[PDB]
Amino acid sequence: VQIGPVTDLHIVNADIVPDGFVRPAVNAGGTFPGPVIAGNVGDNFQIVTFNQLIECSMLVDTSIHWHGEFQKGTNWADGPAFITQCPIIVGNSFSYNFNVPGMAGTYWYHSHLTTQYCDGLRGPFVVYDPNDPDANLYDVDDDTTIITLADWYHVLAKEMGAGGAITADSTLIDGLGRTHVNVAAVPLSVITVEVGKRYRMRLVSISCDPNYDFSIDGHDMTIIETDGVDSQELTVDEIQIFAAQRYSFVLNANQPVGNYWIRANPNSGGEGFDGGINSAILRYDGATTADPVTVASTVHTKCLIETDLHPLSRNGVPGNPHQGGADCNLNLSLGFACGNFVINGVSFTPPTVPVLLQICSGANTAADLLPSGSVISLPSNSTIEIALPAGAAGGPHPFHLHGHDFAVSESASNSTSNYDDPIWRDVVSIGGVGDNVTIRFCTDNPGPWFLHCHIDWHLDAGFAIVFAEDIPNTASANPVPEAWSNLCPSYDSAH
Ligand SMILES: [Cu+2]
Ligand SMILES: [Cu+2]
Ligand SMILES: [Cu+2]
Ligand SMILES: [Cu+2]
């Protein structure tokens, strides 16, 4: 279902059984995944989030992030708990009121408090471009062509331990799928196509953890969008999609009428497709209603390599064409030890006062801000470079920056930098030991912006820092509604 751009969104508890196993959940909009929130580029979004949570097992507080939305001038509406706001308490509501100028494409929204989004609060967010340069490449782009991939757990997030290797109990495609262990024959999702039509498939990772090897038996996929960024056409037969990444791909339904397996193999949890785990069904109108009997190609011959992607627009790369050819170039030490992750030797633990409130209250520099050593200040209108050399315990880590997208100057498993025409995106795999994934952006958005691994269990384990961008201009750029100012007093009073 699609709602927005002006909408209510109730946050409720519900037991659900997507793989046949009932357990508690925290749901946005009553459903799993949440309803698609949609608008057109430049629209004003006004999302009234009513917190009606009762089940403490998964926390009754909440806070919602709009993933890949820049939130310029509205840092207060970003969502990360104790970064830009205190959580909303049960019984209250809060209006996320923001614009999306300049942005179109496929996004998502999730709880940004603790590991709550694992427990169900996740859904797609699409900004339609009425002048999409890609439009002519397909016949169908609508709610039926959104494909979410979700890891699902039989153990409540709050009880995961942590960390501590944690693994999912099934893979859900459009909210249905089968349990990895003692697989029960429960309903699979169907994606219906018509012979000869081309589809804009919007592939959304709403994963708390695993990355997926995504493929469709017998069919090609032509990538045209990555994390909101129109790309030149790239035809692949497999897509490794990491947590919180998005791709639009054109599917040309050019195979014989029939049933074809859709496959999403996670990097942990159940391996293979026995009993139809890691599966959904691509069904042609006119096919018998039966499970597919198709097989994957023994070797995928054109799998997505990220260095093959290039922006549709002439984005280029900011700054100078050599490592550290930036106004402010950074290299972070990313570590894991004794169950916790560190950035520059500091594991992230959420502050009592949100970083935004700290700045609004009078803080002027990173040194003034809590948590100590968990904030790096950035000057305005400056080319930033961030190298994120991998090696920390598993891995591969999908790093994500709030309030910005970025040029991927260096990709996973390839030590050749691209300062000419690399894809821009908002979440990127930093690959493996010896890799040196590197990103560049320009500081044109004052506010405290989260940078973290998007494996939620790793975020909770402290793999995060805040870029406090243009601290002196942060209050003037981001005026707050009284409801925002009411959040922390209500929250602290209740706790
Ligand atoms: Cu996110
Ligand atoms: Cu985000
Ligand atoms: Cu990680
Ligand atoms: Cu985040």
Rounded to the nearest angstrom, the distance between the alpha carbon of 433 and the centre of ligand 3 is 13
Which ligand minimizes its atom distance to the CA of 335?
3
Length of the chain counted residue by residue: 495
Q: Are 175 and 32 in contact (CB under 8 A)?
A: yes
Q: Are 369 and 359 in contact (CB under 8 A)?
A: yes
Bond from prior residue into 163 cis (ω within 30 degrees of 0): yes
Amino acid letter, 266: P
Give 250's contacts (C-beta < 8 A, 6+ positions apart): 137, 138, 198, 199, 200, 201, 221, 222, 224, 233
Q: How far is CA 215 from CA 250, 281, 296, 308, in A?
A: 13, 11, 8, 18
Catalytic positions, written as ranges: 65, 67, 110, 112, 397, 400, 402, 452-455, 458, 463
Amino acid letter, 489: P
Q: How was this structure determined?
A: X-ray
Side by side, the strands of the sheet bearing 6-16 are 23-28, 6-16, 44-51, 93-99
Count of alpha carbons within 13 angstroms of residue 61, beta-carbon side: 20
CATH architecture of 1-133: Sandwich (2.60)
The three-state secondary structure class of 330 is strand
* Domain residue spans of the chain: 1-133, 134-313, 314-495
Residues paired with residue 382 on neighbouring β-strands, in sequence order: none
Rounded to the nearest angstrom, the distance between the alpha carbon of 107 and the centre of ligand 1 is 9
Q: Are 341 and 73 in contact (CB under 8 A)?
A: no
The three-state secondary structure class of 196 is coil
DSSP 8-state symbol, 186: P
The three-state secondary structure class of 56 is helix
Rounded to the nearest angstrom, the distance between the alpha carbon of 400 and the centre of ligand 1 is 7
Ligand 4 ion: nearby residues, β-carbon < 5 Å: 450
Token couple for 219: 């069919």
Rounded Cα–Cα distance for residues 388 and 403 (Å): 18
Cβ-in-10-Å burial (0-12, 13-18, 19+) of 315 comes to: middle
Rounded Cα–Cα distance for residues 286 and 283 (Å): 8
Count of alpha carbons within 13 angstroms of residue 406, beta-carbon side: 26
Which ligand minimizes its atom distance to the CA of 403?
2
Token couple for 111: 């709880």
Rounded to the nearest angstrom, the distance between the alpha carbon of 309 and the centre of ligand 2 is 21
Domain 134-313 indexed as CATH 2.60.40.420: yes
Which ligand minimizes its atom distance to the CA of 459?
3
The terminus-to-terminus CA distance of the chain in angstroms comes to 35
Rounded Cα–Cα distance for residues 105 and 67 (Å): 12
Rounded to the nearest angstrom, the distance between the alpha carbon of 126 and the centre of ligand 1 is 14
What are the E-state strand segments in 117-216?
Answer: 122-128, 146-152, 170-173, 190-193, 198-205, 212-216
Task: Kindly give the residue spans of alpha helices, DSSP state H, lying in 274-411.
Answer: 355-360
| 1-133 and 314-495 agree in CATH topology | yes
Token couple for 147: 């494909």
What's the chain's Rg over C-alpha atoms?
A: 21
Rounded to the nearest angstrom, the distance between the alpha carbon of 448 and the centre of ligand 4 is 12
Which ligand minimizes its atom distance to the CA of 205?
1
Token couple for 184: 């029960």
Rounded to the nearest angstrom, the distance between the alpha carbon of 464 and the centre of ligand 4 is 9
Which ligand minimizes its atom distance to the CA of 70?
2
Rounded to the nearest angstrom, the distance between the alpha carbon of 163 and the centre of ligand 3 is 11
Rounded to the nearest angstrom, the distance between the alpha carbon of 33 and the centre of ligand 1 is 14
Rounded to the nearest angstrom, the distance between the alpha carbon of 109 and the centre of ligand 2 is 8
Please report the DSSP string for 324-374 in residue order.
T-SSEEEE--EEEETTEEEETTB-----SS-HHHHHHTT--SGGGSSSTTS
Q: Are 8 and 51 in contact (CB under 8 A)?
A: no
CATH for 314-495, options being 2.60.40.420, 3.40.1280.10, 3.40.47.10, 1.10.3720.10: 2.60.40.420
Task: Kindly give the residue spans of alpha helices, DSSP state H, lying in 29-155.
Answer: none
Which ligand minimizes its atom distance to the CA of 396?
3
Q: Residue 341 — φ and ψ, nearest 5°?
A: -100, 150
